[model samples]
Target chain A: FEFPEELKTKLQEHINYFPKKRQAILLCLHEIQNYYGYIPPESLKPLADMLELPLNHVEGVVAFYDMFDREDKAKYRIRVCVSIVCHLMGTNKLLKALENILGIKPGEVTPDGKFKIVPVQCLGACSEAPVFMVNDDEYKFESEVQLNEILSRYT
Target chain B: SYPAIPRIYAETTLNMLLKRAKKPRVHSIDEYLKDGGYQALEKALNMSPEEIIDWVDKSTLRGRGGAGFPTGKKWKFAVQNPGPRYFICNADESEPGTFKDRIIIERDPHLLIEGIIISSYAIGANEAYIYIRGEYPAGYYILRDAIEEAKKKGFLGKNILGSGFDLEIYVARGAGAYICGEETALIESLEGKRGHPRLKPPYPVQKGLWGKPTVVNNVETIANVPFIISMGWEEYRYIGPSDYAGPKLFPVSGKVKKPGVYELPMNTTLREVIFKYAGGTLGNKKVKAVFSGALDCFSSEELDIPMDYSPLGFGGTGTVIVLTEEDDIVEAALKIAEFYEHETCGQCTPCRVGCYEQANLLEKIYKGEATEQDWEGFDFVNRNIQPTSICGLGAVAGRLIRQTLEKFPEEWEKYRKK
Candidate 1:
């Protein structure tokens, strides 16, 4: 049930912001996930206890959202946006190019454990269609060549 | 010749919002105050709630987040309700061709805060919450800091500007649910639920946010309040089309040479936005088609389509996607259908079954595997989904398919057995 020292302060901030204390579940989960690449199974019970919500409430949110990856293990996570704007502008082609070059498909970590590529819905930057995120930073890759340069820089 | 140009068009709209955004410390309260940021809050605080509402109403300002509802009337409705009023700024901009809200949020975060302060005061709300999208890490953090800054400066918390009125703002990030952008769905999410769209009769203005009268406004809609109050509605009116006032940021992308957010006036032509502003189609490829404004798109014939909402019929989501000469209509339609299928919150039968079935039908058609029965099924789902589905996501998903059939009837005929 033990966790990071900083999360207690974040949880307190989120609790004061919302009308109810139980509503801070998402922020707690986000903090935990951000600190540890994915939401570790062990952390959920403690999260429910800390947020003062039932374990089911904590687990229900984890199941519904796409970003909360429980089964991922990658040092460098890359979220490729594969939504409407990105699709029209060749996200699939870029995704295929990444799969070919990185030797991995989306939702899989590289053999070196250096990269975990996952596809996301619209990242709220459509004009920068075919955009991706390395951790939390967004970049619109105009082509496979551009993406390759980015990948090279990362690894 | 029929569609007249806006007084403010393409890139000029940028100056209105992004003026001080490039500055390193404009996100701070002291820096924002130097530029007269809280002046709107001061003036709005002085006016009667009715006066502030009337001033904004005079501009004919409408919601920019796809619904196109008039902002003045919506605010008035909340203020009129008997019980405690709540304010929720919709920052969940998830539409396929839209990201203009992100720019406003990340670059000029304080402008949005000023807008929220005035709108909350005008609506008689003691507190306001911004329901931001989870994907927006940077925006969420910037707004969180901005809210704290506003609180410290006395613009947000307690008696604002010695006016004896009080308001506080908070940021709540969504965990990647597009349906939550819908007002009631957002309310459901705020209450820590699955964010399923509710059947309406007791709309948010009437009974919302813990069963009280809640005024829910979009990020862009609320951001316009300061501009309207600061510049005077008469001056702001000329910034857009004669019909639609205020600067509209159209996020034009796909097959464009310089794809980015363009701040144009309302009624700015698709031609000017795409070719002149966005540097035309990419690779010098001719624009074969356009999903002008939303994924609920139009054909190339509507090339000169104005971004105005009054007469355009469908609600503008402030996004424009251009298709190149090499693009295939069927493939694009299939991909769009797949997006709708994946995103539709499957609470109702029409959306639950229909979106998946629609995506499969479009897929079969694209792959040259469709029979007449598939076309019949596609037609049935297309007609029923929009009219019957509970929310706009499922409703607007059929538009590209509908436009494809109408614009490229000959191209679609190629999929049929010859």
Candidate 2:
């Protein structure tokens, strides 16, 4: 498995922090994902070997956190806030609008590799319902029309 | 003398306030004023709303509720949103292992009331509601008394302190539902409807209580508003870490030698909170796990991580509870999950059904009546429930189980064998 030198050092440091190396398996995998952008299948055995953990343990950790992207992801991630406050203000309609505009449903990236649309639980901006975060920028009070205008700006 | 300021009572925020008040019950309005309660409001009312907002933003004050949203930004949203808006003080402290808000309400209602007035004025809200939890009977009455006294003294009713701001404040009681702790759901309950979460987009700032723009802040968050206004934002900002500013109330409870509320600068280390202020675990038992907010507890593996807004694994709300080796981590998590499940107001299908199903499965696992297949099924249920819930309660509940299963697999496996 190929890993950046910095990521390899991080994995070693994380493993050293725990008394049982196996316990650091998840942290190492997470660090690798952070560096590599996604966890490769080949990397699991090396992570397990390095952390003295079984292969299953590494697999379990990857599957646990939804934030860990198992597959390759677009450089730009679009998270639409579908939380309760957003939903009350027609966030579902807005989500549908995003799907229509992007030609992709929630959890799917565009074929062009420009955008990935995902729905988050809450961004804690309930006061600004129908909010969505593109990359790191949060846009609030977003209607379908407003979302389209914003999405158009991105691509 | 007083034994050189008894160590047990000296460290807590409530203790300091109680010591200063020197009254049997500081819940009374007259007593609070005598202790310099509304002085901050009196000072803030003289300032323009922009000044107050700028002060809060500069102070870097974040919400004290489970989600540490910026308090000043929340106010800015309220102020920017065209209103007749509403202000809500979320006093529903139903999260398991969290009891600081109850003490705040029962001991210093005036502080919260004063903060409400100042916050309402800054946000341009004319109507305010204090949504008190049903379980804490004492806090409810204390707040009621404080509100009545404030009204009688012309501090709450019309043109409060002659600032020409007309505001009416009322108390709404939650029916012991933890879901009501969710801000939007609390607003729904306040509007005399079944407590259920609404989707965000036209957030509460645009459409809140009674379909008007509203600002829903936690009791502790609102309590800091007056202080932010009084101290100036820059001074308040210097109190904590750079990302999260201001002093925060940390309610440390359970299996600790000194379990109480300690006011610390934000981003204070978890090690300091547990070992220093909380006396380093009860009966000298090793700490097996630590919960920051009642719902989001971390295992001992995470103890070394700094307790901050972003690094705390979960959202920072500043309510930390420690669990000793004597406590069964699985049982504790189950009890916490049961609390959320039982309190779910059957409004959303996923929350209503999912919570119950999760709770039932957890109970089965706890009783040693489940298999590995059931364990896998349990984890699957836990994972799938997150995207489907109506509010944070279900999502938080799902996180609790998922995190527990991932962190403490052996304990979960033991239950299946039983």
Candidate 3:
């Protein structure tokens, strides 16, 4: 299967950046994920061959980590860090709020594709308590008063 | 009198590193040059490689990235090896409650660059890579811009600053793997392999990164490199206490009044940091527990303990988070267990199987559905997992249960099987 036009240049660009071919898989997988929202079933063999790795090895990595997914993501991706530190920081209720507002559970995406709430292990922004990053624009809060304000601005 | 001096560097008195980052726009090479940034690179190039490596040993500089290996000793290993070596900056700071590296990357990018260039010179590695966490979009762009600026100024690439030394630094981003924080696993990730931990003996020092000698140092550890080069090892020793002799970034979050990062002497106590520095717990809610660094829970009883390397028994990624009276230790432990269960690289049986069971049992315990077997299974993990597991993350999975059981006996009784 041929990679999309947008993916070819970005994937090749990252492939040239690294000294080794194998090093480009993770970089390219993210590109594929961004370009196609997820690594499709057919894209794996082509990606593995392009980056010079066995299909099994590529599958192992794409399966091993949390960053990759096989399904398309929502238009507005909002994830809450549900680690102990973050849970205590009001991530639970904010997640509860996202569940309520989107009419979907933590892992569920909206039918309209506008929003989804996912539980992440940690966003590495524990410094900012009650942290929830939406499309990578993160915010922390003392209370849920601003939840509607922050969420409404996106749509 | 437990004198906890909160203001150590500027007011409490120490600035080995905190000095370089005080100015605005220090990310630019021209702005960095004003603070005598690349002088260390110039100084290191003039000295013999032997002198440079030995200087590190004498300074007693240690790594801040959890594994307290002496910086000089690590450099000494890489320096003695042949050329075509690699230097890796493990900037994948994914540990929860840690953001010091982000602070440096956003506000003090050039400092990290200077440190990396100096480190490359010390170990005689011509090419270096900074493996930053993908979550750090701001930091990644900031470092990329800083590298370009340095390249333009002749500080990096091709006979750097006319010293007949050539070095190139590249920024590589990690794709959300907490296990990659481990040095060998990081190298595996760098090679585009699964982020699984490799066995030691053929350590990264002996053979790493495409089967060559590679020296992998954490971002905070590498960022401290320029100081060891410029300050003259003897003078750098005076920067902090004898045990941990350097400036360290200590971040206090959770229930603190002032939750932010502070650069201070490594010798400060948790008492000085919490009550004095962070103004104690928020809303006067008594601090029920405090994690001194990363998720090793230290209750309020040991709040007075020193946060230094010798006292703390590990060189942890300084990530302190406080808990108030409202927080529950059992829930906290389970959540941490869940985190480990979510992140274990699944290579070894002890970690792969054990962390999952631990999380499962803890969740059962949390919901009051557990039987007596949960404690027994946890006991097995507590004793065997640390020695059997491949890396630190597995050990932490056991610690979550073991420490919670030991520290909070009264809390355990409430959930005790009838």
Candidate 4:
């Protein structure tokens, strides 16, 4: 598969920010994942070639980071904070609410492939504890009622 | 809209880094200039680099990023290495219950930018990077705009302020690795490698980021520079105690009635932080325990100690997470254990294996499947992980385990076989 031309242009511009082209690996993967829901394997070789690095090195970086997902199983990803503060403030109940509404447990995608739920460590939004992210947007999880209203925006 | 910045108890605490906080449009350069923002940079430019470092040393400004290392000594180390040095702002606030840096990045981006410029000048570095965590998408964009505005105003880019000091600041993003908060890991990540810790002897200040001498200061640490430079360290030193001087930002969360960020002097006590500023526990329930700086979980009676660099040597991020009688201490310990376990880089044997065992033991205890024998194994894991681990993660996790087992013996007693 071909890397999107526009994204490639953006990646090219990012190279100047660093002293070496290899420093742009994380930035490239972030942009790639934003374009496609996950970092497609097809884009790895192209990214390595662009950065003048080996494909394996680029692939290793992808596997190490938490946000760089390989699977494209769902359109929307819900990452619930499972860290101490979030857990103390009803994150489990919110996960239960999500399970009932989506009919899938934590780590499973919905039947329609529209959503997936997974417990995340902290998003550093601890002051706004029991928080979750619907893709790029961070929402404070108040209750089942608030969770239902917020998830409506995605699909 | 995002929740408002945590209300600062004006009667008790002071605002230096967060002076622009809760104010609208301070992120913009025009508004920043109108409020006398870069006056510090101007004064800083007139002074020698050595003088600025000396001022910081006198002020005793420690790194706000957990470690609490003195910022002056760190800069001194970098200067000894040579020219072509790099100054990095560690914006990857991966510590749980910590969001004070996020407030600065979002609300008053210009203040952080100005601080970066001044610090870069003091360190004699022309190139700088703000290594922000990937979780903060909004912060990334806000900083990008703020840098652009600063460059246009002659605060960044070549020949900054005609002082013959050339500087260019770039914003680099991490891909969600909590380990990257470590200076070496952060340097490795900024260089497009998997974020992992490196061995000491050749520290980041000596050799970092493309093998150049680098100085990596936390977001809040550098943010305090301009204030120190402007106020004069002689005046700034009196803000708090002799060793733990200057204002600090504490992010208090969990069962507090009002959970938010509060900017107070370093000497503020845990009791004042929870009771006075945070409006006590939510629903006024009996206080159970509190996690200070992600290091120790202190019981209710232990809140009398001052939350400063003194006790913070144990482990401090200015992040305070409270728990009430309504909350289960055992489950909270489990969550803390699991956080370290999940975030472990798997680089060293003790940390990788020990963190896993630590969390597993906690899970077993939480499920009532643990026997007294399990506590023996848990103690062994904690003892080994504390010193054998390559980085701070495993050690902190070990302390957390030790704190949990010691502080709340009754909670663990329930899981033991009769």
* lDDT of candidate 4 over A3-90, digit per residue (tens): 7789889889777679999898888888887777678898898888889999999988998998878876567889899999999987
Looking at model 3, residue A66 earns an lDDT score of 83
Q: Worst 10-residue stretch by lDDT in candidate 2 chain A? A: A141-150
Each prediction's fraction of true contacts recovered? 0.00, 0.00, 0.00, 0.00
* Chain B TM-scores of the candidates: 0.92, 0.91, 0.92, 0.94
Q: What are the iRMS values of all candidates?
A: 18.5, 21.6, 19.1, 18.3
lDDT of 2 by residue, A41-113 (tens): 8888878888777889778888887767778657567888877888898687767877778888888888976
Candidate 2 residue-wise lDDT, B7-121, digit = tens: 2232543333333322324456645654456667867888998888888877777777877778778888877777888989999887766766665676677888888898888
Candidate 3 local lDDT, B226-321, one digit each (tens): 888877888888877875787888866889888877777766778788888777788989878876444577778877776777755323666788
What are the DockQ scores of the candidates, in order?
0.01, 0.01, 0.01, 0.01
Over B247-332, each residue of candidate 1 has an lDDT whose tens digit, in order, gives 77777778888777787777778888888788887788777887754366566667676778857533476688889878887787
Candidate 4 error regions (>4 Å): A1-155, B1-12, B24-26, B312-315, B371-375
**Which residue runs of candidate 1 sit more than 4 Å off their true CA positions?**
A1-155, B1-10, B21-26, B313-315
The pairs that clash in candidate 3 are B7-B12, B8-B12, B8-B13, B9-B14, B66-B315
Query: What stretches of model 2 exceed 4 Å from their correct place?
Result: A1-155, B1-10, B13-24, B312-314
- Residue-pair clashes, model 2: 21
Ranked candidates (lDDT, high to low): 4, 1, 3, 2
Tens-place lDDT per residue, model 4, B277-349, is 8899888998898886556788887887787877433238768898999788878878888888888999888
- Model 2 docking category: incorrect
